[PDB]
Amino acid sequence: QQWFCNSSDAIISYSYCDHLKFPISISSEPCIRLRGTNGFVHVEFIPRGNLKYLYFNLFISVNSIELPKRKEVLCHGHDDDYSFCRALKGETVNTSIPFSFEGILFPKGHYRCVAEAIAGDTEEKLFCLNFTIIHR
Amino acid sequence: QQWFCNSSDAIISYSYCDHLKFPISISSEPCIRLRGTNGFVHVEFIPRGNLKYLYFNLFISVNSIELPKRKEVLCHGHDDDYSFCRALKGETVNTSIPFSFEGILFPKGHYRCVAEAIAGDTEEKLFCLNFTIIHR
Amino acid sequence: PCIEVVPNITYQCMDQKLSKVPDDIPSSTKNIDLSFNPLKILKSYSFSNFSELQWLDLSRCEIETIEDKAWHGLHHLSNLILTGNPIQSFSPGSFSGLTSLENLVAVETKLASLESFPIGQLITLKKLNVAHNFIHSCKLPAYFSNLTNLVHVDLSYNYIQTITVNDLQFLRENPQVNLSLDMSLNPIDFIQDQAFQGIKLHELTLRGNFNSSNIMKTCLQNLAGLHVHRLILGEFKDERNLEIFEPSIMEGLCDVTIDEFRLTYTNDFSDDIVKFHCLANVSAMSLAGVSIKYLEDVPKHFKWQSLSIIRCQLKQFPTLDLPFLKSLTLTMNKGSISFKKVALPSLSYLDLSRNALSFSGCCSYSDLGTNSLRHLDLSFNGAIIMSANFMGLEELQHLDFQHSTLKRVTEFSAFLSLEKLLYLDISYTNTKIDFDGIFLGLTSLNTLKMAGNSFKDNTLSNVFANTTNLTFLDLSKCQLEQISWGVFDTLHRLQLLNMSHNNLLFLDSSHYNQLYSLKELALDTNQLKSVPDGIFDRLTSLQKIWLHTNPWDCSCPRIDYLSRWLNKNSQKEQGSAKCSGKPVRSIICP
Amino acid sequence: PCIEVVPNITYQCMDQKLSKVPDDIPSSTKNIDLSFNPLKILKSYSFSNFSELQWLDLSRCEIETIEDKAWHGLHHLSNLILTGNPIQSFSPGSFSGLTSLENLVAVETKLASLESFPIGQLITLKKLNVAHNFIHSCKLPAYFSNLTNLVHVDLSYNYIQTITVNDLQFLRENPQVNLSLDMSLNPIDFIQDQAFQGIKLHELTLRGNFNSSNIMKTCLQNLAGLHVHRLILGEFKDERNLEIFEPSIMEGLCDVTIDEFRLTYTNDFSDDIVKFHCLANVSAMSLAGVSIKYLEDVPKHFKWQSLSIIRCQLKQFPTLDLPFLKSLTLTMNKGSISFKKVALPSLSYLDLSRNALSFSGCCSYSDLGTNSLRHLDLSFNGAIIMSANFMGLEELQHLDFQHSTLKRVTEFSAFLSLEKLLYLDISYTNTKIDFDGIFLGLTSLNTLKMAGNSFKDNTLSNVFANTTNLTFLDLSKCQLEQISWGVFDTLHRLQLLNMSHNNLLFLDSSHYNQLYSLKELALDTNQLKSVPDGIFDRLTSLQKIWLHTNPWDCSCPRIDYLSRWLNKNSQKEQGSAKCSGKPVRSIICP
Ligand SMILES: CCCCCCCCCCCCC/C=C/[C@@H](O)[C@H](CO[C@@H]1O[C@H](CO)[C@H](O)[C@H](OS(=O)(=O)O)[C@H]1O)NC(=O)CCCCCCCCCCCCCCC
Ligand SMILES: CCCCCCCCCCCCC/C=C/[C@@H](O)[C@H](CO[C@@H]1O[C@H](CO)[C@H](O)[C@H](OS(=O)(=O)O)[C@H]1O)NC(=O)CCCCCCCCCCCCCCC
Ligand SMILES: CCCCCCCCCCCCC/C=C/[C@@H](O)[C@H](CO[C@@H]1O[C@H](CO)[C@H](O)[C@H](OS(=O)(=O)O)[C@H]1O)NC(=O)CCCCCCCCCCCCCCC
Ligand SMILES: CCCCCCCCCCCCC/C=C/[C@@H](O)[C@H](CO[C@@H]1O[C@H](CO)[C@H](O)[C@H](OS(=O)(=O)O)[C@H]1O)NC(=O)CCCCCCCCCCCCCCC
Ligand SMILES: CCCCCCCCCCCCC/C=C/[C@@H](O)[C@H](CO[C@@H]1O[C@H](CO)[C@H](O)[C@H](OS(=O)(=O)O)[C@H]1O)NC(=O)CCCCCCCCCCCCCCC
Ligand SMILES: CCCCCCCCCCCCC/C=C/[C@@H](O)[C@H](CO[C@@H]1O[C@H](CO)[C@H](O)[C@H](OS(=O)(=O)O)[C@H]1O)NC(=O)CCCCCCCCCCCCCCC
Ligand SMILES: *[C@@H]1O[C@H](CO)[C@@H](O[C@@H]2O[C@H](CO)[C@@H](O[C@@H]3O[C@H](CO)[C@@H](O)[C@H](O)[C@H]3NC(C)=O)[C@H](O)[C@H]2NC(C)=O)[C@H](O)[C@H]1NC(C)=O
Ligand SMILES: *[C@@H]1O[C@H](CO)[C@@H](O[C@@H]2O[C@H](CO)[C@@H](O[C@@H]3O[C@H](CO)[C@@H](O)[C@H](O)[C@H]3NC(C)=O)[C@H](O)[C@H]2NC(C)=O)[C@H](O)[C@H]1NC(C)=O
Ligand SMILES: *[C@@H]1O[C@H](CO)[C@@H](O[C@@H]2O[C@H](CO)[C@@H](O)[C@H](O)[C@H]2NC(C)=O)[C@H](O)[C@H]1NC(C)=O
Ligand SMILES: *[C@@H]1O[C@H](CO)[C@@H](O[C@@H]2O[C@H](CO)[C@@H](O)[C@H](O)[C@H]2NC(C)=O)[C@H](O)[C@H]1NC(C)=O
Ligand SMILES: *[C@@H]1O[C@H](CO)[C@@H](O)[C@H](O)[C@H]1NC(C)=O
Ligand SMILES: *[C@@H]1O[C@H](CO)[C@@H](O)[C@H](O)[C@H]1NC(C)=O
Ligand SMILES: *[C@@H]1O[C@H](CO)[C@@H](O)[C@H](O)[C@H]1NC(C)=O
Ligand SMILES: *[C@@H]1O[C@H](CO)[C@@H](O)[C@H](O)[C@H]1NC(C)=O
Ligand SMILES: *[C@@H]1O[C@H](CO)[C@@H](O)[C@H](O)[C@H]1NC(C)=O
Ligand SMILES: *[C@@H]1O[C@H](CO)[C@@H](O)[C@H](O)[C@H]1NC(C)=O
Ligand SMILES: *[C@@H]1O[C@H](CO)[C@@H](O)[C@H](O)[C@H]1NC(C)=O
Ligand SMILES: *[C@@H]1O[C@H](CO)[C@@H](O)[C@H](O)[C@H]1NC(C)=O
Secondary structure, eight states: OOEEEEOSSEEEEEEEBTTBOOOOEEEEESOOOTTEEEEEEEEEEOOSSOOTTEEEEEEEEETTEEOOOEEEESOOSSSOSSGGGGOOTTOOEEEEEEEEEEOOOOOSEEEEEEEEEEETTTTEEEEEEEEEEEEO | OOEEEEOSSEEEEEEEBTTBOOOOEEEEESOOOTTEEEEEEEEEEOOSSOOTTEEEEEEEEETTEEOOOEEEESOOSSSOSSGGGGOOTTOOEEEEEEEEEEOOOOOSEEEEEEEEEEETTTTEEEEEEEEEEEEO | OOEEEETTTEEEOTTSOOSSOOTTSOTTOOEEEOTTSOOOEEOTTTTTTOTTOOEEEOTTOOOOEEOTTTTTTOTTOOEEEOTTOOOOOOOTTTTTTOTTOOEEEOTTSOOOOSTTOOOTTOTTOOEEEOOSSOOOOOOOOGGGGTOTTOOEEEOOSSOOOEEOTGGGHHHHHOTTOOOEEEOTTOOOOEEOTTTTTTOEEEEEEEESOOSSHHHHHHHHHTTTTOEEEEEEEEOOTTSOOOSOOOGGGGGGGGGSEEEEEEEOOOSSOOGGGGGOGGGTTOSEEEEESOOOOOOOOOOTTOOOSEEEEESOOOSSOOOOOOTTOOEEEEESOSSOOBOOOOOOTTOOEEEOOSSOOBEEEEOOHHHHOOSOOOEEEOOSOSEEEEOSOOTTOTTOOEEEOTTSEEESTTTTTTTTTOTTOOEEEOTTSOOEEOOTTTTTTOTTOOEEEOTTOEEGGGEEOSOOSSOTTOOEEEOTTSOOOEEOTTTTTTOTTOOEEEOOSSOOOOOOGGGGTTOTTOOEEEOOSSOOOOOOTTTTTTOTTOOEEEOOSSOBOOOTTTTHHHHHHHHHTTTTEESOOBBOOOBGGGOOOO | OOEEEETTTEEEOTTSOOSSOOTTSOTTOOEEEOTTSOOOEEOTTTTTTOTTOOEEEOTTOOOOEEOTTTTTTOTTOOEEEOTTOOOOOOOTTTTTTOTTOOEEEOTTSOOOOSTTOOOTTOTTOOEEEOOSSOOOOOOOOGGGGTOTTOOEEEOOSSOOOEEOTGGGHHHHHOTTOOOEEEOTTOOOOEEOTTTTTTOEEEEEEEESOOSSHHHHHHHHHTTTTOEEEEEEEEOOTTSOOOSOOOGGGGGGGGGSEEEEEEEOOOSSOOGGGGGOGGGTTOSEEEEESOOOOOOOOOOTTOOOSEEEEESOOOSSOOOOOOTTOOEEEEESOSSOOBOOOOOOTTOOEEEOOSSOOBEEEEOOHHHHOOSOOOEEEOOSOSEEEEOSOOTTOTTOOEEEOTTSEEESTTTTTTTTTOTTOOEEEOTTSOOEEOOTTTTTTOTTOOEEEOTTOEEGGGEEOSOOSSOTTOOEEEOTTSOOOEEOTTTTTTOTTOOEEEOOSSOOOOOOGGGGTTOTTOOEEEOOSSOOOOOOTTTTTTOTTOOEEEOOSSOBOOOTTTTHHHHHHHHHTTTTEESOOBBOOOBGGGOOOO
């Protein structure tokens, strides 16, 4: 809907969540191969809050079987690894984030992952993406 | 009753347990100083079972406050550290065991410790000593 | 159209398609968020009714024009945020009327230079953020002498390529000024010879400035003469990084006096970088997100008084004998390391939390080589095997084991030496309390957090006899089913007692007759069906009680005491104890 | 006077002040313990009625005289224990009649030599223990050629000071004999030149023989020519020990062919001892109770096919790249070590239990460098952080995490690769199951031990959908309160289901309609008060059920099905389900 790509073992797409539509352009280069991928996550958006304490809530499901909520902190508030942790509310963010992963066996089937970005100082929701990953 | 000694901070004595009176001569040289001691435990007795899997059950109390049972294995049955692990039922055992400990703060007062020697292959009780330690 | 957040005080007008500031906003408002509205122009006198306004957010408001009296009436405004507005040209007097301004955020306003920026009369200004603009000069303007309170300037993410002698003239003239400069994400490739002679700075941040090792090495050399309290260096993962990072890149740092050195992420790294001789006179050394694998053989003439290793990648616990080291933080390390004995005779603060650390032989003097330890954090780790009760460490005031796997802590008085301990957290350590003497010696203890554990036979035993000065006791989620007699008769100063989320089947009236100081009692979420008559009668200090989520038996005359008590003391009850649905407080027996 | 232990089979007559063997002992007895009785003399024909006797213990019986027909009638006796009896002189024919004897224990009988020991016609003898006597010669007598089945001789704790060429003549003559010699605690100070040429031994134990380094080094050299399957060396803590233990003490071992080398406790030790070049061709290396601190840089030309490190003192996990190593045991290590990656391409067996070990990144091929792993024991350790689901290790058959702190095992399918796994133990790992897919891929799993954990909302969820071949499921002490629908409909081959010591409030009749193979069902020690009618009707294979320690409601017609069922199937019930005291099986509704 909002974006999608084809991997050799994965079909990945996302929309905005039904409850939050704050805009953001995310993509990966190349498309993510669940067997393993080295690439970049390109992000361009204008955040609705400071990113000094940005973290994510990930609600993942495999074939309608839900995993516990996981929290992934990206900016801890002190000497953070990423240049966008400095970004303020209303500031244009344009960055490419390198990533590299490998060697986890994923079960085949239909994954859902709503990714909820939170400004950790105010606990306010920055945006929410509804992901769909079809493995195989 | 059966033996006792005076330390600079401890008075140590033992009798046989009321339920098991299999004889054994135990002493330490010097008397145990709970602040710290290097010495020998002299043991001379004729065991009522093989010592190949000898372990101890220790029931300790401080001022009538009971600690959980602790199990101290002396002979594991394979390449054991002590020459008496080879001893058989009915064989004269005569040994001096070096020991060295230090730097644990013990609360003052009245300790009881019944020490129950068990032959771990047969689970039979080899002997039982009722210890009394008065710290300070 | 504005979300009322705190009545007549705080209003959230963000993203409401507002063309102008609403006149409906009450005059006593202190905080207004107008961001993400197409304001386009700040008209004169628009905020003149908000005499008590302190914080005003106009981020992403498409503002091109600030009219000549746009901020008339804002005598008390201390925070003004203009991020993302394409103002570009700030005409003279653009900030007239902002007589209490302390924090000006002009990020991404297409600002081209500070010389033309009309802030020379904001004599109250403390912080200036002009990141993400078109500034290409490092010149600190002369009007900074009017801004006697300015302590921080953010120049991050601009186009500064050069730092000249004259650029820092103002600071050379004024050595009394305390100023911090954030230069991150500027394409600096030239620093003039001796530009930093006679220059003093509090905090200097140089992150993500350099693409090439040779350019970074050449520029660091011309920091010579500089005196900084805190120098922050490093790169970002999402920016083009240095090809190689050798220690000799920082050879220039020898001609700089540095009190505190912070190193952040670098693409390349070598363990020798932390042992670089130009860092020898630093008093606070810090590593965050750095690929250090081994920290060993730090020369004893190093003067580090605090060391901080955060989110790093140590394969093996450091070997350290720094005699002047007072604080050590090794936290959030990538991997699992085992503790190794250190010799830090000046050590008074130790944070080893979140390392999946395995500690064999906790704890005594020989592990640490110090008699001055006051703070010890071993939380969020692996196996911590208790084998000594802190001989040599009786100065310890704070002890945290939260979420580590405490082993053998109940087989002796593991804390007997800690007669000055104020704070103990053994929550969620999977400890099964089976020794009444577990807390012997803890006579100074005020805060005891031990939630998520359990007790032998699920009975709360007499473990609090010596903890006579407890003021905070958290026993939640301890699978408790009953309480032994006299467990609380000593805690005359206890102010909080949390026993929620247990399996209590009955209470006894005797346990609460000596909680003279008890203010808060949490008993919700148990299996309680009744209380003895008068159990709450002597709780003369009580202010809050939780009793909900219990299967209360509301039959008369059984529920009589509780219903009448909950009614008379309805201001104290938090939540609603409801009958197995009517609140127990709403039941009148005959 | 004899304690009857197993009727007409086993009798315990120890320490009953018996003067002679009791004639009351039944003739079919197979095991008699007569120890610690003042027998003083074994009279002729005393045991002639015990034709089926196999094991006879006469330890500490003060026996001085064995009469010339003392063992008449004992044609089937295989074990005879004479420990502690001052027999001293064994006259000719002293063991006549013991025609099936396999194990002769003559420990501490004041025996002076084997040459005069009349055992030359015990052609069935397999084991000979003559420890703790007055033997001063190492001469293996010539009649050993009659004893074709003798495989073990215990000479420990005697007075042997010398080993000569002629002492081992018998073994030199007979290279086909498989014989093991225990020489421990003999004051050996001289081995003749070439005494061990042409000598083959299965197991040779030399523990606690030497007081001086020079005497041990001199004696080890003259083991030259010896071929031993298993050589055991070391000292005892409770005996006078070697002053220093350098590797060169074992220079003589280069002239010995050793298949397996065992080193035990030594007072002195140096890490180089395990890297000694004379151990290069050993195929099984073992260390037990040894003060080794670092095991590093083992030359790759070492041929060790198994390494065993038990009760040692490693400060740091070994670095090992032995390409022929098939089995590695590092267990009960003193301290806490962190796992370090190894490169063992032949590794098929790995036991790392009881180390308080912390493992960051379990588990995949890169941790171990092998595709042939079948056995992995990580139990009784610290923090084991699950981050990979065993890619590269799909040959794994046995996996044990018992009592370790498993972390993040429920955040993905941590075992998806393990399609050949037969045995999984995650008991007492403080795992809170919150993912129904936790056991995806475990289609070969037969044994699942997961006691002592818990589930989200205390509900047993649908985690067994893929484990179609489970035969053993242990869910005890999991704080379960209820079971989701259909959790067991797949387990047609399950034979045991243990759900005892939970908090089950009700059962559903649907959960047990497809347990076709279920033999044993443990439901004791819950909160059960009733069962649905017919819940046990389709358990056609049931043989044992535990239902006691439950507050059963014995009111009619509610308890009708259960009481009638427990009565009709009373042979299957283990223990007694008693009413909230009469057994439920003893209740007849109208
Ligand atoms: C502003 C809005 C943001 C919107 C997009 C969010 C950003 C997406 C990517 C962010 C993290 C990726 C960088 C990964 C680095 C690791 O690759 C790298 C770890 O990997 C290891 O690192 C080692 C050295 O570091 C070795 O290299 C290892 O290799 S080994 O073989 O030698 O041993 C290698 O495994 N580092 C990390 O911090 C890991 C933490 C990253 C996870 C946290 C966030 C994950 C996703 C965030 C939310 C998901 C939703 C996305 C769309 C909404
Ligand atoms: C046949 C019947 C027996 C009747 C009597 C029973 C024997 C009594 C003594 C047996 C063990 C003593 C040897 C101690 C060695 C440690 O001292 C020594 C450990 O200590 C450390 O060891 C390191 C190197 O090893 C360093 O040296 C350390 O120092 S550091 O500073 O460098 O780091 C040092 O701390 N080793 C051990 O195995 C410890 C295990 C011993 C406890 C198990 C049994 C304890 C008592 C048994 C029952 C009690 C009842 C007694 C009367 C009935
Ligand atoms: C006549 C009566 C017979 C009496 C015989 C009684 C036995 C004597 C005790 C033997 C010592 C036990 C081993 C402890 C060594 C410590 O020194 C030990 C060293 O343990 C360290 O803790 C970690 C885990 O173990 C690491 O493993 C360390 O290793 S590391 O290098 O990696 O860091 C290791 O060092 N510290 C301790 O606090 C342990 C407890 C001290 C024992 C105190 C016992 C007092 C006995 C009182 C006698 C009264 C009569 C008894 C009646 C039954
Ligand atoms: C006051 C007089 C009464 C005293 C009674 C005298 C009895 C002697 C006690 C012996 C204690 C030392 C045993 C440790 C051996 C290490 O060696 C042992 C190493 O750990 C195990 O050592 C085994 C050796 O091989 C295996 O390696 C095990 O592997 S395992 O998985 O099979 O279990 C391994 O873990 N260290 C520890 O545990 C931690 C240190 C011991 C803590 C003991 C504290 C004090 C105990 C005395 C009780 C008095 C309390 C008074 C109330 C306040
Ligand atoms: C356009 C959409 C944007 C997509 C962005 C999504 C982010 C991409 C993932 C970033 C990698 C995370 C870091 C993991 C590194 C591993 O390589 C990591 C290395 O972890 C090791 O495990 C230990 C503890 O961490 C030690 O710390 C090791 O260290 S050691 O040296 O001491 O032994 C360390 O190496 N192995 C793993 O199995 C972890 C999990 C693998 C991550 C797979 C994620 C798949 C993402 C699928 C994307 C679909 C779209 C997403 C929708 C929201
Ligand atoms: C299929 C498409 C859906 C996928 C969704 C994409 C989302 C991206 C997931 C990111 C995972 C990697 C994050 C780890 C970073 C390390 O860095 C991290 C190091 O550990 C923490 O790392 C922090 C960095 O600073 C702090 O150091 C923490 O300190 S703390 O105490 O504050 O917490 C420290 O412990 N390794 C781990 O945890 C263990 C390895 C991660 C296991 C993840 C397994 C696979 C997850 C994907 C879910 C799919 C399941 C499918 C069902 C079968
Ligand atoms: C080291 O870091 C520098 C960033 O600070 C890089 O140089 C900058 O590269 C930008 C492109 O990546 C340039 O942008 C463009 O600017 C020119 C004007 O000079 C315009 O005509 C172009 O249109 C514009 N780009 C686009 C897409 O329109 C910056 O001007 C340039 N700045 C400087 C000071 O050089 C280096 O490339 C970088 N080195 C490496 C190896 O990454
Ligand atoms: C190295 O180990 C040897 C043990 O195998 C020690 O030597 C033995 O010492 C015993 C005493 O400790 C001697 O016992 C005595 O034997 C003599 C006869 O030789 C009797 O007269 C004595 O009465 C008797 N002792 C008593 C108390 O009655 C052993 O004879 C002797 N054996 C040998 C072969 O020498 C060494 O002492 C020991 N070295 C060290 C430094 O410990
Ligand atoms: C120089 O100015 C800064 C203004 O921020 C002062 O800094 C802070 O000190 C307090 C207490 O020591 C800390 O809580 C802050 O976190 C510090 N902030 C920064 C940015 O360092 C500094 O103390 C001043 N120096 C003086 C007045 O001598
Ligand atoms: C030599 O004799 C011994 C007799 O004990 C044999 O030893 C055993 O082998 C079995 C199986 O391999 C093990 O279970 C025992 O533990 C071994 N015992 C000992 C003492 O090693 C040995 O196999 C024989 N060698 C032959 C017959 O070739
Ligand atoms: C995610 O998308 C699915 C499918 O369109 C939808 O059913 C679900 O409600 C969405 N979840 C959100 C928006 O949180
Ligand atoms: C943001 O960066 C991307 C490059 O990945 C590209 O679209 C362009 O350079 C930027 N977009 C802008 C400035 O609108
Ligand atoms: C140990 O001795 C005490 C005091 O004499 C006695 O009360 C107790 O019963 C004894 N315990 C035994 C023998 O187990
Ligand atoms: C046992 O050894 C002790 C020495 O500690 C001493 O009584 C004597 O040597 C031996 N006792 C005997 C042999 O009765
Ligand atoms: C601590 O407990 C002991 C009991 O052994 C008691 O004698 C002492 O007075 C108590 N002191 C304090 C301050 O709790
Ligand atoms: C009691 O403990 C619960 C469980 O963690 C917690 O949520 C609650 O805030 C506590 N009550 C207090 C602190 O009053
Ligand atoms: C395992 O579970 C999957 C569900 O994702 C199913 O398709 C597959 O047939 C199952 N196989 C076995 C052997 O349990
Ligand atoms: C069920 O689990 C309990 C608790 O450990 C155990 O005692 C019992 O033997 C088990 N029942 C079996 C194995 O039948």
